[PDB]
């Protein structure tokens, strides 16, 4: 009785939301952008190949200066690379060999890692002794950590398999805020350019936009058919691209509050592991399970180019802050730079 | 320039040399050791086997290092994780074997059927096609008592038990009842028909009947891991 009427009320709220969205879709993005010139053909070439990892590499995150990167591999190793000279700067071993995510602090004074150990380990790179040792450990989560990004030196947001996200305090050690509402595992998250709002994409085929202070979900975005594996904002922060296992990327507008265009092709039947935008947002780079990466026109939904320099599945793909080059890391323990 | 750039480059090269030297020994140790992942249900008896391994020699993963005849082994137990395992099971594609322990006597409603796709999904998973799985059918003693009593029947939960016969290559233990002998071999074939359906000769299954108090479980893993990386080497030589 009570549960049934709550379900009916939720259903008619959803109906009202869908009707409101339909009353807003006056014209599609394709019709508006049919009158601009195409980007032509882009041919990205491989410059640097980084070698030295034993096992498969999952994650990398470019620095603020677009010069250094960090790579995490199941040999228990976080290798901090310098991309310009292909020289290894740091190599941090772990207590637990299984790592799934990594992050690089905007100030460059810290790095983060986590995984099946349920512990977010924050490593300090500016130790007085000169050796890098574990600086902070956070163990409040009850699920595997899938992604973690820094807000500043003293705060971190972590997405775990407990269907909840958490904003911590490194100095304090306790969870400052918890974000609940996702029904599945939160696989990836992306921060806004003004670090004021952030989206979390889960295995419930949905993404949610959260406010850092308020700690409440502002808007929920659906439309995907499978598990959302990667998510990234547009440079302006008013839209974002989501990639899922259904071999489709989708662009959602925050102000419009529904999808704008879907990037998909009939020749792709493999999942999407990593999505990232260019500096101007005109091109969308998506890494796929077929050992291949595709660069799409963000305004034409046309496959602009193909990058096929990997042997195993592409696990991480990132565009620098300056957008000069794109780094792709795959399971064959190789990191590559394209430009 | 060489005023300061040369010194920085030299220092960075020396550092990279030091990390390469350390990673050489780290890689030697890593290749020396073999990584095993332990999976099972909540009542599959994996804790008993872990304790038996540990006595001879909330955290989200427990690491057990033991040596059998001067060979390193890493044994990972997954805990404090949700039952949704379609995401983190991809982390174990490079393990030499997945020690799968299934409570045989636990046939909610049906642990054995639920345990079947936990093996089937692993077998047909895209990223686990190159990982061998060792099947351990625990609680052999408890299985025998239930069959001898006759209270519970396999045919109630598996309709194909009626027409199945005892394998001609079977080697029953002395003093074992003929009835329990046929039943305990039927469970193996349930995992075996799934085992040889796909893969096209890239990973195989190594069933073994073990008791929770058997001290020779190290030898079974010793011989299986001796053979898992012995068939893989034989596939590169096209001798198989």
């Amino acid at each position, epitope marked *: 009785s009570e549960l049934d009427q709550l379900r009916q009320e939720a259903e008619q709220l959803k109906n009202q939301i869908r009707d409101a969205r339909k009353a807003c879709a006056d014209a599609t993005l394709s019709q508006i952008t049919n009158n601009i010139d195409p980007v032509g053909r882009i041919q990205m070439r491989t410059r640097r190949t980084l070698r030295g990892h034993l096992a498969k590499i999952y994650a990398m995150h470019w620095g603020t200066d677009s010069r250094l990167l960090v790579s995490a591999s199941q040999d228990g190793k976080l290798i901090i690379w310098d991309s310009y000279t292909t020289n290894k700067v740091h190599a941090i071993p772990l207590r637990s060999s299984w790592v799934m995510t990594c992050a690089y602090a905007p100030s460059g004074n810290y790095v983060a890692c986590g995984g099946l150990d349920n512990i977010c380990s924050i490593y300090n790179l500016k130790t007085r002794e000169g050796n890098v040792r574990v600086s902070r450990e956070l163990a409040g989560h009850t699920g595997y950590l899938s992604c973690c990004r820094f807000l500043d030196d003293n705060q971190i947001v972590t997405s775990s398999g407990d269907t909840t996200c958490a904003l911590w305090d490194i100095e304090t050690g306790q969870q400052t805020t918890t974000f609940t509402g996702h*029904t599945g595992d939160v696989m990836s998250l992306s921060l806004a350019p003004d670090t004021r709002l952030f989206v979390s994409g889960a295995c419930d*085929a949905s993404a949610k936009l959260w406010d850092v202070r308020e700690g409440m979900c502002r808007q929920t975005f*659906t439309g995907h058919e499978s598990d959302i594996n990667a998510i990234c904002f547009f440079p302006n922060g008013n839209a974002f691209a989501t990639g899922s296992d259904d071999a489709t990327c989708r662009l959602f507008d925050l102000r419009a509050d529904q999808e704008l265009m879907t990037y998909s092709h009939d020749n792709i039947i493999c999942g999407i592991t990593s999505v990232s935008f260019s500096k101007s947002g005109r091109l969308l780079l998506a890494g796929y399970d077929d050992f291949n990466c595709n660069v799409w026109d963000a305004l034409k939904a046309d496959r602009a180019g193909v990058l096929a320099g990997h042997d195993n599945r592409v696990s991480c793909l990132g565009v620098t802050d300056d957008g000069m080059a794109v780094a792709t890391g795959s399971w064959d323990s190789f990191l590559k730079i394209w430009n | 320039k060489t005023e300061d750039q040369r010194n920085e480059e030299k220092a960075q090269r020396e550092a990279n040399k030091k990390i390469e030297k350390q990673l050489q020994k780290d890689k030697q140790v890593y290749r020396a050791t073999h990584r095993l992942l332990l999976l099972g249900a909540g009542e599959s008896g994996k804790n008993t086997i872990v304790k038996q391994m540990r006595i001879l020699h909330t955290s989200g993963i427990f690491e057990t290092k033991f040596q059998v005849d001067k060979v390193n082994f890493h044994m990972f137990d997954v805990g404090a994780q949700r039952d*949704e395992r379609r995401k983190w099971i991809q982390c174990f594609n490079d393990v030499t074997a997945i020690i799968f322990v299934v409570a045989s006597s636990s046939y909610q409603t*049906n642990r054995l*059927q639920a345990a079947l796709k936990l093996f089937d999904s692993i077998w047909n998973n895209k990223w686990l096609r190159d990982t061998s799985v060792i099947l351990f059918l625990n609680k052999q003693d408890l299985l025998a008592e239930k069959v001898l009593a006759g209270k519970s029947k396999i045919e109630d*939960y598996f309709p194909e038990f009626a027409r199945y016969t005892t394998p001609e290559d079977a080697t029953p233990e002395p003093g074992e009842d003929p009835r329990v002998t046929r039943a305990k071999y039927f469970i193996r074939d349930e995992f075996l028909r799934i085992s040889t359906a796909s893969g096209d000769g890239r990973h195989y299954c190594y069933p073994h009947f073990t008791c929770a108090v058997d001290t020779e479980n190290i030898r079974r893993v010793f011989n299986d891991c001796r053979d898992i990386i012995q068939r893989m080497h034989l596939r590169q030589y096209e001798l198989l």
Partner: nanobody
Amino acid sequence: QVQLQESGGGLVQPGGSLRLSCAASGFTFSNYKMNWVRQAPGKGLEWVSDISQSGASISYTGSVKGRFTISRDNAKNTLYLQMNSLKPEDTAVYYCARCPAPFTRDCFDVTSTTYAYRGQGTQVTVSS
């Protein structure tokens, strides 16, 4: 929005027959293989049946093999489960589930307690 709605449940006398229907919207139904699961009162989730993308691969559990018939219609995006000769042990809440990824032979976490890709389910009660 991906939504799966089930219908056809209710109370059935022993030995009866029922037809559970699952209507799925928000995705390409022809690219996924589908499952029927059940939950006994006071017990955990137990898988019942599964059907492949084109209907070639159909498998049944031990308790319902030969008594259940699963089918799918890609034209209307509908999934049908015909239950024959119902017994009191079949009294459960039945759910229509979909595999997490398309074009995948494996199907993980369909018996998980907090699975997102399942409908609210329907009650099927066998009583005298």
